[PDB]
C-alpha cells in the first residue's frame, strides 16, 4: 500500500533505501609483500577484467 500512497495522492516517485556496510580495512600497499600469498594483489584491485594498455 505504501507504493500506492506515494503514487496516487502524494504523486511522487517512491524512494528505495538499502543498508550499506563500511568498506573493509586493508593496511597500506607495499611494493614487496614479503611472505604473503598470491591473493595479496587481489585485495587492492578495483576491476576484475583484463586491460591491455597501448596494445
Amino acid at each position: 500500500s505504501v507504493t500506492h500512497t506515494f503514487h496516487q495522492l502524494l504523486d511522487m516517485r517512491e524512494p528505495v533505501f538499502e543498508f550499506v556496510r563500511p568498506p573493509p580495512y586493508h593496511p597500506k600497499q607495499k611494493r614487496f609483500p614479503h611472505e604473503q600469498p598470491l591473493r595479496y594483489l587481489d585485495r587492492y584491485r578495483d576491476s576484475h577484467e583484463p586491460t591491455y594498455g597501448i596494445y
Binding site: 586491460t51 591491455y52 597501448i54 596494445y55
Partner: protein
Amino acid sequence: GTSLDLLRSLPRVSLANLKPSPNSRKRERRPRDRRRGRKCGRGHKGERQRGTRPRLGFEGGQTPFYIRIPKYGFNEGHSFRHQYQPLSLRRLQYLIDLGRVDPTQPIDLTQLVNGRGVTIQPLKRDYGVQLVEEGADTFQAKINIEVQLASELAIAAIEKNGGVVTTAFYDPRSLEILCKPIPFFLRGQPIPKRMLPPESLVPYYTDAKNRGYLADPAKFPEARLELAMKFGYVLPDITKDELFRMLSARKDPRQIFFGLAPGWVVNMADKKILKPTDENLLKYYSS
C-alpha cells in the same frame, strides 16, 4: 627566431670553439691523491681487500637461500608454449582513422605489419595476432579481417557493423615468410605449402562458433544469428552490400598469399612469375 640573429653577431664557428652539452660527462677518478689513494677504498687487510671474496649467493657455509627452496615447475616447457600478440579494437580503429591501413581491401598480417600496427617476433615463438575486446563499444568500421585467434565479444563487434572475421592457422615456417615476404623472394626459391594445424588445435579451427577456416560453411548462418540474439542487435545481410565480393574473399587452406599458388617463383628483377610444367611437381604442390 631571435636566436639565429645572435649567430650573425658572434665569431665564426670552427674546430677551436667546440663545447659539449653541460653535465654530459662525469669526471673519472684515479687513486693517486690522498683522498682516493693509500688504501684506495678497499679497507683493512683481509680477503676483500686482496680481491678474493666468495661468489654471489654464498652465505658463509650454511645452505644458501636459492638452494634450500624446493624445485617446482613454474617454467617447465616455457620454450614450447605458443604466443599470440594482442590487437585491441582501440588500436585497430586508431589505425584506420589515420590512413595507415586500407579498409577497402582485405586485412591480414602482412597489411598490419606493413603499417607498423603490430610487431611480430617469429624467433621468440610468436604465431600471430589475437583480437581483443577492449574498445568494442566505439568500433564503427566495416572490414574483412583474418586473425589467428578471436574472442566472443570481439567477433560480435566486427559483425554488428556488417563485417567478416575468420580465424586461420600459420606454421612457424609460413609465418616468417608472411611477415617479411620481399626477402624471401630474393632467395630464388619456390613458394612452399602451408601445413595443417597440429592435432591439439584441430578442434578449435574446425568449429563454426570460432569462425574457423576449416569449419563447415553451412553451419555459419546459425552461429552468426545466435550472437545477434545474445548481444541485442539485428543481423545485417551483406549479400545486398555492394562490396560482397571483397568481404567474402578467402584464401585456400594451403595458400599463403591471395593471388599466388604454391610452387611459383617470383622474379622481382624483371617483373615476371615462373610456373613449373612437371606433372610430379604440380601434383606435389596441389596436394
